């Protein structure tokens, strides 16, 4: 089966360069034109560049022309994209793609994507704060708790809840960017017979800083 695997993404300083690779298997790579297509976070698809089967014909999107170079190594089954003079608006998931036929202008097979993030922000671990109800009596068969995960960079963060019921419902709220840093929150809703009678903790992993923080949710 046809398979395309991108690599080379990561964090880039504004103005910097990065070279992406795409490894092809399961078809005769030298027989087919190839494309790069990108997708900025929470936005649509944008085609980036094309190279024909034997590199004779190349096209670029006007917005990357003069900065990006597409190339290929046919005997070693690899497509490349060299990026230079990168800017904030080049932040995107980068996909390689190819069509059914020799040089047709559409995308029948896609890789999984490699993420390129362009920012001068410094890698920063989050501050993790518990969201527990204020003092007072409560009613109802369930209680909601949260964790506020503030001031981190880069985006990748995972919050996992430990609670006393398999029925517990988790919501993960998308991170918002401020002053170069991200903030997100996560809520959990558990039966009121399991908290504060049983322990509830949120565990926040930030792989880019190799940090993990556990916060126990305590009653007022």
């Amino acid at each position: 089966d046809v398979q395309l695997v991108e690599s080379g993404g990561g964090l880039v300083q504004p103005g910097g360069s990065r070279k992406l690779s795409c490894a092809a298997s399961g078809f005769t790579f030298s027989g087919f034109g190839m494309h790069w297509v990108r997708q900025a976070p929470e936005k649509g698809l944008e085609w980036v560049a094309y190279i024909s089967s034997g590199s004779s014909l190349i096209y670029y999107a006007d917005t990357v022309k003069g900065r990006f170079t597409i190339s290929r190594d046919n005997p070693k089954n690899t497509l490349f994209l060299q990026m230079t003079s990168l800017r904030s608006e080049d932040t995107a998931m980068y996909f390689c793609a190819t069509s059914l036929y020799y040089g047709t202008p559409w995308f029948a097979y896609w890789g999984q994507g490699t993420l390129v993030t362009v920012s001068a922000a410094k890698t920063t671990p989050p501050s993790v704060y518990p969201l527990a109800p204020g003092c007072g009596d409560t009613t109802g068969s369930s209680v909601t708790l949260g964790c506020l995960v503030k001031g981190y960079f880069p985006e990748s963060v995972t919050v996992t809840w430990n609670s006393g019921s398999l029925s517990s419902s988790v919501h993960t709220f998308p991170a918002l960017l401020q002053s170069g840093l991200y903030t997100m929150s996560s809520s959990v809703t558990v039966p009121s017979s399991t908290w504060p009678s049983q322990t509830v903790t949120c565990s926040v992993a930030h792989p880019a800083s190799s940090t993990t923080v556990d916060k126990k949710l305590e009653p007022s």
Partner: protein, 213 residues
């Protein structure tokens, strides 16, 4: 550079319904292509050369069009079809895309469950104070939240974040965060968040008072 306009930008359907979405072009197109994408996954090709069904794609999908007007139709919606759909045109390079139609799964109404939380003692030691309100598990997506501090509406310093449709019950949720300095937070007493939804016969109000207990 042909510009492609997709309509509607967002729509919802229940399983069993027919679904049609359109893609119009600023100049004549030679072929149109259609793609489906779900969050965290790569796009997949649905339709090529305007009306050809791609291999392995379910037959409920079909494409049509000519000139400057194109469409994609799902004869009978299945729950697994909810996704964003993109059109892409061939005429001459560059290849361009529409901005997408997001097809949501239609669902029974659900009122939000609202919860307010005061700033933690840990956050206050850092000089900041975030008051958080969760509005969870509601449908449909449009909702309004209003903050009041000692009874006076506050708009500055509020940030709202919406989840995508839940993969289990197809509802939405939203978090609303009011951010203050520590000193400002400790100069006021009552903090209120108020949710108004299509389901709410009265707005749902949650509050706490700093000087109560």
């Amino acid at each position: 550079d042909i510009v492609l306009t997709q309509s509607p930008a967002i729509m919802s359907a229940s399983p069993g319904e027919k679904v049609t979405m359109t893609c119009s072009a600023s100049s004549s197109v030679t072929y149109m292509y259609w793609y489906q994408q779900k969050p965290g996954s790569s796009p997949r090709l649905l339709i090529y050369d305007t009306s050809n069904l791609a291999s392995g794609v379910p037959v409920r999908f079909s494409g049509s069009g000519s000139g400057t007007s194109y469409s994609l139709t799902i004869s009978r919606m299945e729950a697994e079809d909810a996704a964003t759909f993109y059109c892409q045109q061939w005429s001459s390079y560059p290849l361009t895309f529409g901005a997408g139609t997001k097809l949501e799964l239609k669902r029974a109404d659900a009122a939000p469950t609202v919860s307010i939380f005061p700033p933690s003692s840990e956050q206050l030691t850092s000089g900041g104070a975030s008051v958080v309100c969760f509005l969870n598990n509601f449908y449909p997506k449009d909702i309004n939240v209003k903050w009041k501090i000692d009874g006076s509406e506050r708009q500055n310093g509020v940030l709202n974040s919406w989840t995508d449709q839940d993969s289990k019950d197809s509802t939405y949720s939203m978090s609303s965060t009011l951010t203050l300095t520590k000193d400002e937070y400790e100069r006021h007493n009552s903090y209120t968040c108020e949710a108004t939804h299509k389901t709410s016969t009265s707005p749902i109000v949650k509050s706490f008072n700093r000087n109560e207990c």
